[PDB]
Amino acid sequence: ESHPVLEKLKAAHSYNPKEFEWNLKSGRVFIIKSYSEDDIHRSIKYSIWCSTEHGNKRLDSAFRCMSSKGPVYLLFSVNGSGHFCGVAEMKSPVDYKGKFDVQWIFVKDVPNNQLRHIRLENNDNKPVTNSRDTQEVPLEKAKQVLKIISSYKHTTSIFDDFAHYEKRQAVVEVVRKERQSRNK
Ligand SMILES: *[Se]c1ccccc1C(=O)Nc1ccccc1
């Protein structure tokens, strides 16, 4: 059994494309650390993301700075998960408590031990897997990461739990509407 929302998404977008240009002529790449998989699910189906106030200021600056001379890529990982779950392109400046359009491109789990050997000189040579939200990846290291994520033969992705997230969100909504109703 597959969910019809996921089927509409799969038919309308080309997730995990076989021909992806990882050796960029230009562009900038950033690590997004999400608090939960729920946020990732919502982001994939609505093509939207928000960081913190400072995160949105930095991503705003990067997007407007690039002036469509190249892409701005976001590599997503949930705090404490041990893998990246996909990559999306930032597609609009931040709109104002600050949201912005994103286009998901890769939706696949890449374990951290596939990427931990890549270290970030602008972050005390710490592994790319030990980054904070909106940490920028140097371009050549970005190409190493994009190549690895693009070519990895993933065995799973958040899509495998799609219906589960669908149900969670729905229950949460009712739980809120009832609780709020009980207050007034
Ligand atoms: Se973020 C945000 C800010 C203002 C209005 C709406 C949103 C939104 O839809 N956010 C969201 C989508 C997916 C995952 C996390 C947050």
DSSP string, 25-51: SS-EEEEEEES-HHHHHHHHHHTEE--
Residues 6+ apart with CB under 8 A from 165: 37, 38, 41, 158
CB 72 within 8 A of CB 88: no
CB 120 within 8 A of CB 158: no
Whether 12 is in a domain gets the answer no
| 48 C-beta closer than 6 A to ligand 1 | yes
In angstroms and rounded to an integer, the radius of gyration of the C-alpha atoms of the chain is 17
Pairing of strands 28-34, 135-137: antiparallel
Which pair of structure tokens corresponds to residue 14?
A: 């080309």
Question: Could you tell me the resolution of this structure in angstroms?
Answer: 2.7
Closest CA to 73 of 159, 155, 142: 142
- β-strand partners of 31: 75, 135
33 is in an annotated binding site: yes
50 is in an annotated binding site: yes
Whether 132 is in a domain gets the answer yes
Angle, helices 162-183/4-12, rounded to nearest 10 degrees: 120
Which pair of structure tokens corresponds to residue 161?
A: 């739990």
**Spacing, Cα 125 to ligand 1 middle (Å):** 33
CA distance 23 to 14: 20
Longest Cα–Cα distance in the chain: 57
How many domains is the chain built from? 1
Whether 161 is in a domain gets the answer no
Whether 177 is in a domain gets the answer no
**Distances from the Cα of 31 to the Cα of 49, 131, 146, angstroms:** 13, 7, 12
- Tokens 């608090």 sit at which residue? 35
DSSP string, 115-164: TTT-EEGGGTTEEGGG--TTEEEPHHHHHHHHHHHHH---S--GGGGHHH
| 126 C-beta closer than 6 A to ligand 1 | no
- β-strand partners of 111: 83
CB 58 within 8 A of CB 134: yes
Atom 1 of ligand 1: nearest residue by CA position: 50
Cα angle 132, 66, 21; round to 5: 80
* φ/ψ (deg, to 5) at 131: -105, 160
Mutate which of 90, 99, 103, 172 to test ligand 1's pocket (most atoms within 8 Å of Cβ)? 99
CB 72 within 8 A of CB 24: no
Whether 102 is in a domain gets the answer yes
Q: In what order do the strands lie in the sheet with 83-90?
A: 48-49, 100-111, 83-90, 72-78, 28-34, 135-137
Which pair of structure tokens corresponds to residue 36?
A: 């939960």
Cβ neighbours, 10 Å, residue 119: 15
**Spacing, Cα 47 to ligand 1 middle (Å):** 10
Give the domain extent around 100. Answer: 20-153
Whether 167 is in a domain gets the answer no
- β-strand partners of 87: 75, 106
CA distance 168 to 21: 36
125 is in an annotated binding site: no
SS3 content of the chain, % helix, strand, coil (to 5): 45, 25, 30
State the closest ligand 1 atom to the C-alpha of 50, by its place in the atom list counted from 1.
1
Whether 70 is in a domain gets the answer yes
